[PDB]
């Protein structure tokens, strides 16, 4: 029918089949100009149909709008005047066909649709929307033919057709501005994100994310200019939906639960299919148009390699091929970021809808369940499960396609080469086996590896923290070998694991090679009549390299869901948990009573017996009632029932009002103490200074740094029992509700401050004097002023009654009032924390294994143990003792790491590693040049000539060349494995011993947070990730190099694409670098906020549910929810837009090649055509893995520059010089002070001056002052802790300066400040360098009164100590250290005040003993008990740092003087 309707052949074979071909004007003028209109008319309606239901506001008219109306304008009139042209000029005997009147009314007709489309468009947010980008660039690429068909036939010489050719080009060049004017964003300039506004192109290239990639280049960047996420994201959003489909499963699930086995089994992973199926139907289409180009490129491959292969062909055909290959790389490219980005952001949203779903539920659990689990088990939940699903949704399609690539894979290699395949792919599945034979030996491995890692890191703290004490008694050397023994004893594990991983890389790095040798030897081998040639070999290589990848991903895909199944059945218990029960608690309007029990009885557990049993009391509005009993009472739990946290079993209980909270058991939130005392209230100014004056909260606030706005918490002053209990009444006080149930709030304050309180807060005249008031007691001081008093006894109720009545009744009152009150005296003190902020972690900025295919290994290995290490940093409990905020007020007052990394593993391993290396790449080259040539011998001869010789010569060439190949990269790996085992050796031990020796500035500088972190964490990075790094980037670059070294051998000319495309290369890659950096930064500083916020609430549960203030930290889990899913998606665009960039760069330097291979191809053979492209075609991803690669060795070298710094810390003067004592120095105790002057640090000013005073053998002195007299100064200058600014010390005739460092401290003895006791045995905490032997050892606790607890100890001298000895009570932990210095038995014994919290008797002890044992030596006390001071020959006197009074006490008394003033204002005498 169509010849009619034409007149020319639509098809013939002379069209084609010439050096010149083209398609008729017939075939062109039909099909190509039916495809484009047919695209648009058939999809049109549902464009129109979707614009019309969601018609809104027009948007205001820009430039660009009138002229893409205007240019398609022109095109309508054009095409109107054609119409009339042509009709004009043939009307009267001419059958004109039909082609030139449809054609031009159908063009007429569609150009109207495309008018209208476009204004539709004004009314939605994406103005240039797929449709219309897509239909330009089919009509383009449609029309192109009749160009060239048309501009041949006119330059030919034919010149009958004039007008429709040049209308045909303005067309077509109106077409091509259209196109480009439909690719700008226009944007209404929205500050939330430029995604939902940009055009096709724009979100098809992220050219809109370079914005940020500007921004940051130039300065830092911040929280500020990061665009928000979208709403469909907001966690508000996800959670509703995700709680619909949750709440309609477990109910059903449940309901079969208990149908049958008459818990839940499987609830939680269809709660996630049926609420996100689309992204998964979507992304799934996306995945199986690409798994099509994968094997698209081999066939353009072979069709080049047949094209270059003779002689007698045609250009167009090599030229066309070329073309379609470049276009399959784009659009396979295109396609794959496109599916990256869905399955990612499906990932985010998946785990954001579990971590705060988990959130929310956590507020409402029942507490039967909440007791089952522990404080820190849920927060290690939320951040591990929920990782731990998030990876398993990052790479599920995965599953399908690769039972199908791999399948599609076999199929082309039986249809290239034949049964020998088979052989190729056994080799290449016994592969997995072995690999997991290593593995589970690594796991072993790595858990001792662990475990001894742990216990290194206890002992690190404990020195570090207490530095002093060391310094003291001079104990530094014994540690050094205690802590190498343990780095040896994990060295040699570190080394066996490391010498494992390198088989593991050998066999995944020598496959390609083996399946190639193995292959091609029994192919060519089993029969004579096989014949290699260039095609089928370079082909065959191929789809070998894009088969090696998911027989290597599948095993991993297999166990990481092995994983994910456990995560998920601990999940689904928690989040199906059931319920509190509240059907017990009646909150209604009694009135009548503000308070009524019926006979209620509660249980803690679920049936067990009843803490509280038949309790019937009522207690009216405005009454301050007392609960007392004994231990184990029920009380609080009484008061707990009254929250309702208790299981009902029988009765009721009216409440009517709020209710207020004040626990046993103080809890304190982080933040200042305004913000812990307005607990979410608008702050007032007649209340707040009313509630901290009447708790008495005024004084100790005034002492504090900051003052009201002082950081408390985990992370700042740790408060005491006092004052922490002071602001949770201060809180409750100002929250200022209707019912108070006060437990025991004036426990921990002493008389003063109780009564106080009583007087000014709550009592018959105080701020609650109208609010019910229900206080549970031990002291029956304040009884006289209360309303009615309860005893509780075994849970029940014995007596009620007024304190008169109880008092006349005369029974258990009597015996109960007697002196049952306990008083408590100011409690310790506050305690600073050394700042530990520490998250560094090694899987970042990668999502999964699929962007990086080749380095799966490492990546796998690096996320198990980011989460091994999670835990163990959770379940640790750090113990580096504490500090008194007393003392820390006090102390207040380049390319070159690389060579220093290289110098430590030593040079000369690495010239021959890198030669080895090197060398593999020659043999690689060499090898494919054998195949080359081998591949080219078959030309030659044929079927029934070839001689054996030949046959076997071209093969075991081949197999020794694989061998050689084989032999030098295992070589380069075995070496590689040493050379690191020595870095991590000598890194840490130089550091250690220079650590250790530094002087006390460093340390008092810098918090001891700081220093552990470097032997921690720094260690574990420089001896694990960093070498897979080192030892994956030079293999990446060494491919690249060899494959352009063969393109460029082959032809010359290529030189020179190489310049222009590197300085793109290094430019694109700058920028990267320059941005991702800072985004790996931010992500960190906002992750770890989430955690702390739930451990806070899990912990203080039942003060957030009796306050009803659930709402409002929900919202705070939300937003901080909000503030890291908007920095992860900032580097998840980022890598997807490096991919775009770099793959077409990749493509681009494939593309040119073939060109330059088909204007050159004379002077080529067919395999010279194989070699270069089979190669070049694996190049767009190596640039894309270097870069990435790059960019995470940047980040980790980072370790190395730390660690050097704290290497080079200064030092202090030498430990031993030449210049020795006398035997004997000390001899005499003969000390004496020459102007002594001296300064803590540069910049400050000295603290002692002019001192002069003589020290006698045998004497005991008291040295006594005021505050910030230097008084500890002066035992800090004994021990030459500081330098000497002016002035000396003379001992024995001999300046302390002269004798060594540790020569000096030996022969002296000073009793600690604050006793501390390392862990071990107690032969460690009592002599560390085992010199004496038990014998004497077991005189000094007979001497220190402290024999009878030893001996009858578990063990004698060998019995174990917990953290600062834990195990051991106060009393002995002071006592001990009194024995620690008895057994050096010194000459010169420095004393300090330090029997301040020593019981009377035992203090007596102590100050006896010292008496008694101490008399042929010399004692210097500086002390602030002034009566404890009478018995000093000479008593010195210090003011702010001079001497002022030396003389006998006596006589200091006798004379009235300054000491005799502070004797009267102390009344000694
Ligand atoms: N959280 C709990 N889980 C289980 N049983 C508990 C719990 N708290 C208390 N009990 C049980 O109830 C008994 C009484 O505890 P409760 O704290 O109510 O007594 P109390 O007299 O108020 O104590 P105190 O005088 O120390 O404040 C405990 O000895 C224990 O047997
Ligand atoms: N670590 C330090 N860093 C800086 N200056 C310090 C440090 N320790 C002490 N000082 C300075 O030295 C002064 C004297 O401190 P020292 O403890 O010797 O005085 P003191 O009179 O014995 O104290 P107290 O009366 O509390 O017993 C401090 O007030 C302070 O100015
Ligand atoms: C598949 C397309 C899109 C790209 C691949 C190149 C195409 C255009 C080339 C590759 C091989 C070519 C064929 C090679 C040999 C013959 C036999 C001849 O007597 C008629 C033409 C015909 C049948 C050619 C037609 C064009 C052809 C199919
Ligand atoms: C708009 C662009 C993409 C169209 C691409 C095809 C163009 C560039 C091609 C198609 C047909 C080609 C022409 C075909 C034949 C000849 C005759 C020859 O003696 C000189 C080159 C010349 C004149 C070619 C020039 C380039 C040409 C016009
Ligand atoms: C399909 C899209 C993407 C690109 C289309 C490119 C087409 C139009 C190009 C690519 C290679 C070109 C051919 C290359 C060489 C010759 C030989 C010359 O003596 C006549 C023109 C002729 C025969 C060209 C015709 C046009 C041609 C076939
Ligand atoms: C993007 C596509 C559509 C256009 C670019 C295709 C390029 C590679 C094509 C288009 C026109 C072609 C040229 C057209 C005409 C001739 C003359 C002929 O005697 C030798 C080949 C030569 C010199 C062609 C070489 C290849 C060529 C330059
Ligand atoms: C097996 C191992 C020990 C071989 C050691 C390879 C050495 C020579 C290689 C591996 C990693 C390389 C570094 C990788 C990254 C960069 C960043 C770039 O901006 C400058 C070069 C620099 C700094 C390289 C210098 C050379 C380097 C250190
Ligand atoms: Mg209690």
Same mark, same amino acid.
């Given at each position: 029918?169509?010849?009619?309707?034409?007149?020319?052949?639509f098809?013939?074979?002379?069209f084609?089949?010439?050096?010149?071909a083209?398609?008729?004007?017939?075939?062109?003028?039909?099909?190509l100009?039916?495809?484009?209109?047919?695209?648009?008319?058939?999809?049109?309606?549902?464009?129109?149909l979707?614009?019309?239901?969601?018609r809104?506001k027009?948007?205001?008219?820009?430039?660009?709008?009138?002229?893409?109306?205007?240019?398609?304008?022109?095109?309508?009139?054009?095409?109107?005047?054609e119409?009339?042209?042509?009709?004009?000029?043939?009307?009267?005997?001419?059958?004109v066909?039909?082609?030139?009147?449809?054609?031009?009314?159908?063009?007429?007709?569609?150009?109207?649709?495309?008018?209208?489309?476009?204004?539709?468009?004004?009314?939605?947010?994406?103005?240039?929307?797929?449709?219309?980008?897509?239909? #330009?660039?089919?009509?383009? &690429?449609?029309? =192109? !033919?009749?160009?060239?068909? /048309?501009?041949?036939? *006119? @330059?030919?010489?034919? +010149?009958?057709?004039?007008?429709?050719?040049?209308l045909?080009?303005i067309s077509?060049?109106?077409?091509?501005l259209?196109?480009?004017?439909?690719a700008?964003?226009?944007?209404?300039?929205?500050?939330?994100?430029?995604?939902?506004i940009?055009?096709?192109?724009?979100?098809?290239?992220?050219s809109?994310?370079?914005?940020?990639?500007?921004?940051?280049?130039?300065?830092?960047?911040?929280?500020?200019?990061?665009?928000?996420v979208?709403?469909?994201?907001?966690?508000?959003?996800?959670?509703?939906?995700f709680?619909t489909?949750?709440?309609?499963?477990?109910?059903?699930?449940?309901?079969?639960?208990?149908?049958?086995?008459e818990?839940?089994?499987s #609830?939680?992973?269809?709660? &996630?299919?049926? =609420? !996100?199926?689309?992204?998964? /139907?979507?992304?799934? *289409? @996306?995945?199986?148009? +690409?798994?099509?180009f994968?094997?698209?490129?081999?066939?353009?491959?072979?069709?080049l390699?047949?094209?270059?292969?003779?002689?007698?062909?045609?250009?167009?055909?090599?030229?066309?091929?070329?073309?379609?290959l470049?276009?399959?790389?784009?659009?396979?490219?295109?396609?794959?970021?496109?599916?990256?980005?869905?399955?990612?952001?499906?990932?985010?949203?998946?785990?954001?809808a579990?971590?705060a779903?988990?959130?929310?539920?956590?507020?409402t659990?029942?507490?039967?369940?909440?007791?089952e689990?522990?404080?820190?088990?849920?927060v290690?939940?939320?951040?591990?499960?929920?990782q731990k699903?998030?990876?398993?949704?990052?790479f599920?399609?995965m599953?399908?396609?690769?039972?199908?690539?791999?399948?599609?894979?076999?199929?082309?290699?039986?249809?290239? @080469?034949?049964?020998?395949?088979?052989?190729?792919?056994?080799?290449?599945?016994?592969?997995?086996?072995?690999?997991?034979i290593?593995?589970?030996?690594?796991k072993?491995?790595?858990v001792?590896?662990?475990?001894?890692?742990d216990?290194?890191?206890?002992?690190?703290?404990?020195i570090?923290?207490?530095?002093?004490?060391?310094?003291?008694?001079?104990?530094?050397?014994?540690f050094?070998?205690?802590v190498?023994?343990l780095?040896?004893?994990?060295?040699?594990?570190?080394?066996?694991?490391?010498?494992?991983?390198?088989?593991?890389?050998?066999?995944?790095?020598?496959?390609?090679?083996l399946?190639?040798?193995?292959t091609?030897?029994?192919?060519?081998?089993?029969?004579?009549?096989?014949?290699?040639?260039?095609?089928?070999?370079?082909?065959?290589?191929?789809?070998?390299?894009?088969?090696?990848?998911?027989?290597?991903?599948?095993?991993?895909?297999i166990?990481?869901?092995?994983?994910?199944?456990?995560?998920?059945?601990?999940?689904?218990?928690?989040?199906?948990?059931d319920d509190?029960?509240?059907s017990?608690?009646?909150?209604?309007?009694?009135?009548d009573?503000?308070?009524?029990?019926?006979?209620?009885?509660?249980?803690?557990?679920?049936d067990?017996?009843?803490?509280?049993?038949d309790?019937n009391?009522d207690?009216?509005?405005?009454?301050?009632?007392?609960?007392?009993g004994?231990?184990g009472?029920?009380?609080?739990?009484?008061?707990?029932?009254?929250?309702?946290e208790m299981?009902?079993?029988?009765?009721?209980?009216?409440?009517?009002?709020?209710?207020?909270?004040?626990?046993?058991?103080?809890?304190?939130?982080?933040?200042?103490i305004?913000?812990?005392?307005?607990?979410?209230?608008?702050?007032?100014?007649?209340?707040?200074?009313?509630?901290?004056?009447?708790?008495?909260?005024?004084?100790?606030?005034?002492?504090?740094?900051?003052?009201?706005?002082?950081?408390?918490?985990?992370?700042?002053?740790?408060?005491?029992?006092?004052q922490?209990?002071?602001?949770?009444?201060?809180r409750?006080?100002?929250?200022?509700?209707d019912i108070?149930?006060?437990?025991?709030?004036?426990?921990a304050?002493?008389?003063?401050?109780?009564?106080?309180?009583?007087?000014?807060?709550?009592?018959?005249?105080?701020?609650?004097?109208?609010?019910?008031?229900?206080?549970?007691?031990?002291?029956?001081?304040?009884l006289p002023?209360?309303?009615?008093?309860?005893?509780?006894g075994?849970?029940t109720?014995?007596?009620?009654?007024?304190?008169?009545?109880?008092?006349?009744?005369?029974?258990?009152?009597?015996?109960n009032?007697?002196?049952?009150l306990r008083?408590?005296?100011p409690?310790?003190?506050?305690?600073?924390?050394?700042?530990?902020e520490?998250e560094?972690?090694?899987?970042?900025?990668?999502?999964?294994?699929?962007?990086?295919?080749?380095?799966?290994?490492?990546?796998?290995?690096?996320?198990?143990?980011?989460?091994?290490r999670?835990?163990?940093?959770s379940s640790?409990?750090?113990?580096?003792h504490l500090?008194s905020?007393?003392?820390?007020?006090?102390?207040?007052n380049?390319?070159?790491?690389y060579?220093?990394?290289?110098?430590?593993?030593?040079?000369?391993?690495?010239?021959?590693?890198?030669?080895?290396?090197?060398?593999?790449?020659?043999?690689?080259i060499?090898?494919?040049?054998?195949?080359?040539?081998?591949?080219?011998?078959?030309?030659?001869?044929?079927?029934?000539?070839?001689?054996?010789?030949?046959?076997?010569m071209?093969?075991?060439?081949?197999?020794?060349?694989?061998?050689?190949?084989?032999?030098?990269?295992?070589?380069?790996?075995?070496?590689?494995?040493?050379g690191?085992?020595?870095?991590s050796?000598?890194?840490?031990?130089?550091?250690?011993?220079?650590i250790?020796?530094?002087?006390?500035?460093?340390?008092?500088?810098?918090?001891?947070?700081?220093?552990?972190?470097?032997?921690?964490?720094?260690?574990?990075?420089?001896?694990?990730?960093?070498?897979?790094?080192?030892?994956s980037?030079?293999?990446?670059?060494?491919?690249?190099?060899?494959?352009?070294?063969m393109?460029?051998?082959?032809?010359?000319?290529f030189?020179?694409?190489?310049?222009?495309?590197?300085?793109?290369?290094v430019?694109?890659?700058?920028?990267?670098?320059?941005?991702?950096?800072?985004?790996?930064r931010?992500?960190?500083?906002?992750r770890?906020?989430?955690?702390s916020?739930?451990?806070?609430?899990?912990?203080?549960?039942?003060v957030?549910?009796?306050?009803?203030?659930?709402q409002r930290?929900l919202?705070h889990?939300?937003?901080?929810?909000?503030?890291?899913?908007?920095?992860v998606?900032?580097?998840?665009?980022?890598?997807r837009?490096?991919?775009?960039?770099?793959?077409?760069?990749?493509?681009?330097?494939?593309?040119?090649?073939?060109?330059?291979?088909?204007?050159?191809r004379?002077?080529?053979?067919?395999?010279?055509?194989?070699?270069?492209?089979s190669n070049?075609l694996?190049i767009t991803?190596?640039?894309?893995?270097?870069?990435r690669?790059?960019?995470?060795?940047?980040?980790n070298?980072?370790?190395?520059?730390?660690?050097?710094?704290?290497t080079?810390?200064?030092?202090?003067?030498?430990?031993?010089?030449?210049?020795?004592?006398?035997?004997?120095?000390?001899?005499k105790?003969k000390?004496?002070?020459?102007?002594?002057?001296?300064?803590?640090?540069?910049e400050?000013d000295?603290?002692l001056?002019?001192?002069?005073?003589?020290?006698?053998?045998?004497?005991?002195?008291?040295?006594?002052?005021?505050?910030?007299?230097?008084?500890?100064?002066?035992?800090?200058?004994?021990?030459?802790?500081?330098?000497?600014?002016?002035?000396?010390?003379?001992?024995?005739?001999?300046?302390?300066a002269?004798?060594?460092?540790?020569?000096?401290?030996?022969?002296?003895?000073?009793?600690?400040?604050?006793?501390i006791?390392?862990?071990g045995?107690?032969?460690?905490?009592?002599?560390?360098?085992?010199?004496?032997?038990?014998?004497?050892?077991?005189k000094a606790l007979?001497l220190?009164?402290?024999?009878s607890?030893?001996?009858?100890?578990?063990?004698?001298?060998?019995?174990?100590v917990?953290?600062?000895?834990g195990?051991?009570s106060?009393?002995?932990?002071?006592?001990?250290?009194?024995?620690?210095?008895?057994?050096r038995k010194?000459?010169i014994?420095?004393?300090?005040?330090?029997?301040?919290?020593?019981?009377?008797?035992?203090?007596?002890?102590?100050?006896?003993?010292?008496?008694n044992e101490?008399?042929?030596?010399?004692?210097?006390?500086?002390?602030?008990?002034?009566?404890?001071?009478?018995?000093?020959?000479?008593?010195?006197?210090?003011?702010?740092?001079k001497?002022?009074?030396?003389?006998?006490?006596?006589?200091?008394?006798?004379?009235?003087?300054?000491?005799?003033?502070?004797?009267?204002?102390a009344?000694?005498?």
């Amino acid at each position: 029918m169509l010849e009619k309707f034409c007149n020319s052949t639509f098809w013939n074979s002379s069209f084609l089949d010439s050096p010149e071909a083209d398609l008729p004007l017939c075939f062109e003028q039909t099909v190509l100009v039916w495809i484009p209109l047919g695209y648009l008319w058939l999809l049109a309606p549902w464009q129109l149909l979707h614009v019309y239901k969601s018609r809104t506001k027009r948007s205001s008219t820009t430039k660009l709008y009138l002229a893409k109306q205007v240019f398609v304008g022109f095109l309508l009139i054009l095409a109107a005047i054609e119409l009339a042209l042509v009709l004009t000029e043939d009307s009267g005997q001419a059958t004109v066909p039909a082609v030139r009147y449809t054609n031009p009314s159908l063009y007429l007709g569609t150009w109207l649709l495309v008018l209208l489309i476009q204004y539709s468009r004004q009314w939605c947010v994406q103005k240039n929307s797929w449709f219309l980008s897509l239909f #330009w660039i089919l009509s383009i &690429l449609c029309g =192109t !033919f009749q160009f060239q068909t /048309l501009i041949r036939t *006119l @330059l030919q010489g034919d +010149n009958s057709n004039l007008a429709y050719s040049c209308l045909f080009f303005i067309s077509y060049g109106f077409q091509i501005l259209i196109l480009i004017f439909s690719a700008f964003s226009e944007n209404n300039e929205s500050s939330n994100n430029p995604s939902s506004i940009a055009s096709f192109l724009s979100s098809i290239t992220y050219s809109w994310y370079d914005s940020i990639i500007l921004k940051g280049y130039k300065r830092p960047l911040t929280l500020e200019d990061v665009w928000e996420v979208d709403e469909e994201m907001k966690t508000k959003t996800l959670v509703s939906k995700f709680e619909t489909h949750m709440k309609r499963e477990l109910q059903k699930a449940r309901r079969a639960l208990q149908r049958r086995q008459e818990v839940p089994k499987s #609830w939680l992973m269809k709660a &996630l299919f049926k =609420t !996100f199926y689309m992204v998964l /139907l979507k992304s799934f *289409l @996306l995945k199986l148009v +690409n798994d099509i180009f994968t094997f698209v490129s081999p066939q353009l491959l072979k069709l080049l390699i047949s094209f270059a292969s003779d002689r007698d062909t045609y250009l167009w055909i090599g030229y066309l091929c070329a073309i379609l290959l470049f276009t399959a790389a784009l659009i396979q490219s295109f396609c794959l970021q496109c599916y990256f980005q869905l399955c990612f952001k499906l990932g985010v949203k998946v785990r954001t809808a579990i971590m705060a779903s988990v959130y929310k539920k956590a507020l409402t659990l029942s507490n039967l369940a909440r007791k089952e689990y522990t404080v820190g088990e849920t927060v290690n939940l939320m951040s591990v499960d929920a990782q731990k699903l998030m990876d398993v949704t990052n790479f599920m399609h995965m599953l399908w396609s690769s039972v199908l690539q791999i399948v599609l894979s076999i199929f082309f290699l039986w249809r290239e @080469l034949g049964p020998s395949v088979l052989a190729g792919v056994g080799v290449m599945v016994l592969v997995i086996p072995i690999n997991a034979i290593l593995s589970t030996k690594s796991k072993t491995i790595q858990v001792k590896n662990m475990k001894n890692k742990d216990k290194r890191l206890k002992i690190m703290n404990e020195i570090l923290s207490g530095i002093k004490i060391l310094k003291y008694f001079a104990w530094e050397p014994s540690f050094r070998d205690q802590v190498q023994n343990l780095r040896k004893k994990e060295l040699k594990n570190l080394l066996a694991f490391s010498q494992l991983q390198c088989v593991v890389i050998f066999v995944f790095q020598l496959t390609p090679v083996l399946v190639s040798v193995v292959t091609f030897s029994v192919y060519v081998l089993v029969d004579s009549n096989n014949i290699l040639d260039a095609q089928k070999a370079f082909t065959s290589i191929t789809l070998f390299n894009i088969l090696r990848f998911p027989l290597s991903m599948l095993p991993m895909m297999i166990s990481s869901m092995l994983q994910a199944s456990v995560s998920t059945e601990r999940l689904e218990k928690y989040l199906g948990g059931d319920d509190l029960d509240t059907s017990a608690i009646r909150h209604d309007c009694n009135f009548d009573k503000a308070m009524q029990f019926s006979e209620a009885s509660f249980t803690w557990e679920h049936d067990s017996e009843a803490t509280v049993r038949d309790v019937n009391l009522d207690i009216m509005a405005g009454q301050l009632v007392a609960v007392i009993g004994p231990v184990g009472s029920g009380k609080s739990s009484l008061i707990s029932a009254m929250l309702g946290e208790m299981e009902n079993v029988h009765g009721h209980i009216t409440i009517k009002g709020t209710t207020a909270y004040v626990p046993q058991q103080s809890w304190i939130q982080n933040g200042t103490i305004k913000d812990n005392i307005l607990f979410g209230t608008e702050f007032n100014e007649k209340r707040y200074q009313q509630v901290l004056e009447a708790c008495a909260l005024l004084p100790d606030l005034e002492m504090l740094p900051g003052g009201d706005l002082a950081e408390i918490g985990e992370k700042g002053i740790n408060l005491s029992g006092g004052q922490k209990q002071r602001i949770s009444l201060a809180r409750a006080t100002y929250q200022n509700l209707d019912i108070y149930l006060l437990d025991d709030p004036l426990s921990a304050v002493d008389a003063h401050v109780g009564k106080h309180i009583f007087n000014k807060v709550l009592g018959p005249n105080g701020l609650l004097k109208g609010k019910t008031r229900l206080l549970v007691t031990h002291s029956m001081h304040f009884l006289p002023q209360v309303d009615e008093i309860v005893v509780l006894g075994n849970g029940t109720i014995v007596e009620k009654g007024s304190y008169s009545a109880l008092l006349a009744k005369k029974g258990e009152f009597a015996k109960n009032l007697k002196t049952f009150l306990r008083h408590t005296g100011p409690e310790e003190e506050a305690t600073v924390h050394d700042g530990s902020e520490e998250e560094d972690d090694d899987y970042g900025l990668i999502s999964s294994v699929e962007e990086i295919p080749e380095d799966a290994a490492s990546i796998t290995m690096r996320r198990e143990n980011s989460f091994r290490r999670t835990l163990s940093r959770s379940s640790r409990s750090n113990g580096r003792h504490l500090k008194s905020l007393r003392n820390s007020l006090k102390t207040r007052n380049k390319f070159s790491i690389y060579l220093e990394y290289l110098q430590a593993i030593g040079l000369f391993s690495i010239f021959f590693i890198i030669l080895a290396f090197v060398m593999n790449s020659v043999a690689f080259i060499g090898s494919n040049l054998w195949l080359s040539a081998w591949t080219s011998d078959s030309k030659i001869f044929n079927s029934t000539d070839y001689p054996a010789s030949q046959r076997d010569m071209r093969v075991g060439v081949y197999g020794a060349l694989g061998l050689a190949q084989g032999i030098f990269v295992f070589i380069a790996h075995f070496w590689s494995a040493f050379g690191f085992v020595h870095a991590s050796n000598i890194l840490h031990k130089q550091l250690l011993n220079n650590i250790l020796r530094a002087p006390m500035r460093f340390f008092d500088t810098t918090p001891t947070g700081r220093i552990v972190n470097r032997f921690a964490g720094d260690i574990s990075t420089v001896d694990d990730t960093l070498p897979q790094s080192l030892r994956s980037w030079i293999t990446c670059f060494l491919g690249i190099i060899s494959t352009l070294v063969m393109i460029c051998m082959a032809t010359p000319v290529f030189t020179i694409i190489v310049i222009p495309l590197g300085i793109i290369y290094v430019s694109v890659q700058m920028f990267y670098v320059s941005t991702s950096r800072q985004l790996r930064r931010l992500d960190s500083v906002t992750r770890s906020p989430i955690y702390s916020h739930f451990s806070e609430t899990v912990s203080g549960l039942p003060v957030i549910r009796a306050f009803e203030h659930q709402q409002r930290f929900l919202k705070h889990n939300e937003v901080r929810i909000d503030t890291n899913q908007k920095c992860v998606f900032s580097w998840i665009t980022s890598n997807r837009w490096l991919a775009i960039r770099l793959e077409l760069v990749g493509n681009l330097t494939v593309f040119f090649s073939a060109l330059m291979m088909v204007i050159y191809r004379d002077t080529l053979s067919g395999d010279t055509v194989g070699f270069v492209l089979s190669n070049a075609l694996n190049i767009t991803q190596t640039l894309n893995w270097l870069v990435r690669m790059t960019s995470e060795i940047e980040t980790n070298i980072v370790a190395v520059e730390r660690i050097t710094e704290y290497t080079k810390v200064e030092n202090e003067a030498p430990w031993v010089t030449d210049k020795r004592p006398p035997p004997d120095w000390p001899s005499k105790g003969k000390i004496q002070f020459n102007n002594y002057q001296v300064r803590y640090r540069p910049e400050l000013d000295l603290v002692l001056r002019g001192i002069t005073c003589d020290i006698g053998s045998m004497e005991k002195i008291g040295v006594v002052g005021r505050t910030g007299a230097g008084k500890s100064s002066l035992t800090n200058c004994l021990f030459r802790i500081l330098e000497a600014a002016g002035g000396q010390i003379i001992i024995d005739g001999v300046d302390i300066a002269s004798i060594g460092l540790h020569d000096l401290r030996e022969k002296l003895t000073i009793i600690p400040q604050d006793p501390i006791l390392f862990s071990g045995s107690l032969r460690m905490n009592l002599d560390p360098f085992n010199n004496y032997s038990d014998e004497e050892i077991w005189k000094a606790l007979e001497l220190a009164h402290l024999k009878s607890f030893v001996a009858s100890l578990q063990l004698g001298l060998s019995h174990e100590v917990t953290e600062a000895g834990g195990n051991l009570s106060i009393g002995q932990r002071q006592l001990l250290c009194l024995g620690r210095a008895l057994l050096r038995k010194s000459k010169i014994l420095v004393l300090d005040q330090a029997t301040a919290a020593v019981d009377l008797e035992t203090d007596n002890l102590i100050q006896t003993t010292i008496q008694n044992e101490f008399a042929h030596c010399t004692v210097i006390t500086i002390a602030h008990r002034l009566h404890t001071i009478m018995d000093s020959d000479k008593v010195m006197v210090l003011d702010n740092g001079k001497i002022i009074e030396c003389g006998s006490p006596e006589e200091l008394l006798q004379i009235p003087g300054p000491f005799y003033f502070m004797a009267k204002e102390a009344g000694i005498e």
